[PDB]
Design a protein around this motif. Structure first.
Motif, mmCIF file in Angstrom:
data_model
loop_
_atom_site.group_PDB
_atom_site.id
_atom_site.type_symbol
_atom_site.label_atom_id
_atom_site.label_comp_id
_atom_site.label_asym_id
_atom_site.label_seq_id
_atom_site.Cartn_x
_atom_site.Cartn_y
_atom_site.Cartn_z
ATOM 1 N N UNK A 97 -7.276 17.713 -12.773
ATOM 2 C CA UNK A 97 -8.003 16.637 -12.123
ATOM 3 C C UNK A 97 -8.187 16.968 -10.653
ATOM 4 N N UNK A 99 -8.246 14.722 -8.389
ATOM 5 C CA UNK A 99 -7.576 13.708 -7.572
ATOM 6 C C UNK A 99 -6.506 14.306 -6.665
ATOM 7 N N UNK A 103 -6.306 13.417 -2.637
ATOM 8 C CA UNK A 103 -5.145 12.878 -1.932
ATOM 9 C C UNK A 103 -4.679 13.861 -0.863
ATOM 10 N N UNK A 143 -18.079 12.800 -15.133
ATOM 11 C CA UNK A 143 -18.307 12.336 -16.494
ATOM 12 C C UNK A 143 -19.207 11.106 -16.514
ATOM 13 N N UNK A 147 -16.636 6.831 -13.338
ATOM 14 C CA UNK A 147 -15.669 7.826 -12.888
ATOM 15 C C UNK A 147 -15.734 7.993 -11.375
ATOM 16 N N UNK A 150 -14.400 4.841 -9.554
ATOM 17 C CA UNK A 150 -12.944 4.814 -9.543
ATOM 18 C C UNK A 150 -12.388 5.828 -8.552
ATOM 19 N N UNK A 154 -9.836 5.032 -5.502
ATOM 20 C CA UNK A 154 -8.626 5.807 -5.257
ATOM 21 C C UNK A 154 -8.565 6.282 -3.815
ATOM 22 N N UNK A 158 -5.816 5.108 -1.033
ATOM 23 C CA UNK A 158 -5.064 6.202 -0.430
ATOM 24 C C UNK A 158 -5.144 6.149 1.087
ATOM 25 N N UNK A 165 1.258 4.385 6.715
ATOM 26 C CA UNK A 165 2.386 5.282 6.962
ATOM 27 C C UNK A 165 2.243 6.014 8.293
ATOM 28 N N UNK B 1 7.917 9.098 3.277
ATOM 29 C CA UNK B 1 8.961 8.178 3.705
ATOM 30 C C UNK B 1 9.311 7.208 2.588
ATOM 31 N N UNK B 3 7.445 4.879 1.711
ATOM 32 C CA UNK B 3 6.208 4.491 1.044
ATOM 33 C C UNK B 3 5.283 5.654 0.713
ATOM 34 N N UNK B 4 5.681 6.898 0.997
ATOM 35 C CA UNK B 4 4.936 8.041 0.476
ATOM 36 C C UNK B 4 5.025 8.092 -1.042
ATOM 37 N N UNK B 7 2.075 6.766 -2.194
ATOM 38 C CA UNK B 7 1.019 7.771 -2.301
ATOM 39 C C UNK B 7 1.069 8.467 -3.658
ATOM 40 N N UNK B 10 -0.138 6.108 -6.318
ATOM 41 C CA UNK B 10 -1.596 5.980 -6.341
ATOM 42 C C UNK B 10 -2.217 7.171 -7.053
ATOM 43 N N UNK B 11 -1.763 8.374 -6.700
ATOM 44 C CA UNK B 11 -2.280 9.567 -7.356
ATOM 45 C C UNK B 11 -2.102 9.474 -8.865
ATOM 46 N N UNK B 13 -1.305 6.727 -10.917
ATOM 47 C CA UNK B 13 -2.152 5.595 -11.271
ATOM 48 C C UNK B 13 -3.580 6.015 -11.600
ATOM 49 N N UNK B 14 -4.295 6.552 -10.608
ATOM 50 C CA UNK B 14 -5.685 6.905 -10.864
ATOM 51 C C UNK B 14 -5.813 8.129 -11.762
ATOM 52 N N UNK B 15 -4.776 8.966 -11.851
ATOM 53 C CA UNK B 15 -4.803 10.065 -12.810
ATOM 54 C C UNK B 15 -4.821 9.550 -14.241
ATOM 55 N N UNK B 17 -5.861 6.501 -15.046
ATOM 56 C CA UNK B 17 -7.141 5.815 -15.196
ATOM 57 C C UNK B 17 -8.282 6.795 -15.457
ATOM 58 N N UNK B 18 -8.147 8.034 -14.986
ATOM 59 C CA UNK B 18 -9.192 9.034 -15.172
ATOM 60 C C UNK B 18 -9.334 9.474 -16.627
ATOM 61 N N UNK B 19 -8.303 9.267 -17.451
ATOM 62 C CA UNK B 19 -8.316 9.797 -18.812
ATOM 63 C C UNK B 19 -9.422 9.186 -19.658
ATOM 64 N N UNK B 21 -12.453 8.447 -18.968
ATOM 65 C CA UNK B 21 -13.639 9.285 -18.839
ATOM 66 C C UNK B 21 -13.359 10.719 -19.264
#
Lengths: 229, 23
Positions: A97, A99, A103, A143, A147, A150, A154, A158, A165, B1, B3-4, B7, B10-11, B13-15, B17-19, B21
């Motif tokens: 991916x 993503x 990030x 795709x 996609x 989303x 993200x 991020x 932070x 830290x 809260x990283x 991060x 989030x990566x 999570x959306x990974x 969600x990407x499935x 598609x």
């Protein structure tokens, strides 16, 4: 408020998917050729004022260069480019991916340039102080339009959490305004060349939909023309 | 830290969600 050197051109991110669907019939190689030409232009015009960093996303972020001056030489880049081979066509389509690259791109934009460090060295607690605006360029095989949407979500979340932070961190900076360039490649013949829709006070977003071939490089050139800025 | 990890959340999570598609 010195928007001159602190333009989005000062910070350029390149994210290209080395996921195996970009080796359909070395398509990623073509994308590499076009992006490398863009990177040529930026360093040639602006030897140390427009900067570029590159990221690959074969199931994970593989960054090949840094903001530092030594990395901003194309030969050093080409060694890293040759290091990553072609994506394994039989490898798992899962887990791979772009993503990770996005990030990591947000993290790279939070990082300071040497000129920004000089600005910090002189400046001290001034209003409308040095801003951190940057540009991201993503090239991939998409795709669905959903996609892409989303992916925009993200990136936005991020940036929000990453600025949260980095605000307390005084060796890295928050992003005033990012710019998002989304590029989709179909080889044979769904993404819409959607207009710019800056999604947040920090976020700016753009969408394109064009096929393979250096008409994409020309479109890149039009972007570079806006990006001479 | 502290809260990283968000991060990385989030990566991931959306990974996932990407499935939809990806499939």
């Amino acid at each position: 408020l010195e928007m001159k050197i602190f333009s989005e051109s000062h910070k350029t991110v390149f994210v290209v998917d080395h996921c195996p669907y970009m080796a359909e019939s070395s398509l990623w190689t073509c994308s590499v050729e076009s992006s490398m030409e863009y990177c040529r232009i930026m360093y040639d015009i602006f030897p140390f004022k427009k900067l570029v960093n590159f990221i690959v996303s074969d199931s994970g972020a593989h960054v090949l260069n840094s903001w530092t001056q030594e990395d901003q030489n194309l030969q050093e880049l080409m060694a890293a480019l040759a290091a990553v081979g072609p994506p394994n066509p039989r490898a798992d389509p899962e887990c791979c991916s772009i993503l990770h690259g996005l990030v990591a791109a947000v993290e790279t934009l939070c990082k300071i340039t040497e000129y920004q460090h000089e600005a910090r060295t002189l400046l001290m607690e001034n209003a409308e102080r040095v801003g951190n605006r940057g540009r991201i360029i993503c090239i991939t095989n998409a795709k669905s339009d959903s996609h892409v949407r989303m992916l925009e979500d993200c990136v936005q979340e991020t940036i929000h959490e990453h600025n949260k932070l980095a605000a307390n961190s005084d060796h890295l900076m928050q992003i005033q305004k990012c710019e998002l360039v989304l590029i989709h490649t179909y080889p044979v013949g769904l993404v819409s060349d959607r207009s710019k829709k800056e999604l947040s006070p920090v976020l700016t977003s753009e969408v394109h939909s064009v096929r393979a071939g250096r008409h994409l490089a020309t479109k890149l050139n039009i972007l570079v023309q806006q990006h001479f800025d | 830290e502290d809260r990283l990890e968000r991060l990385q959340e989030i990566l991931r999570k959306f990974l996932y969600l990407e499935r939809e598609f990806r499939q």
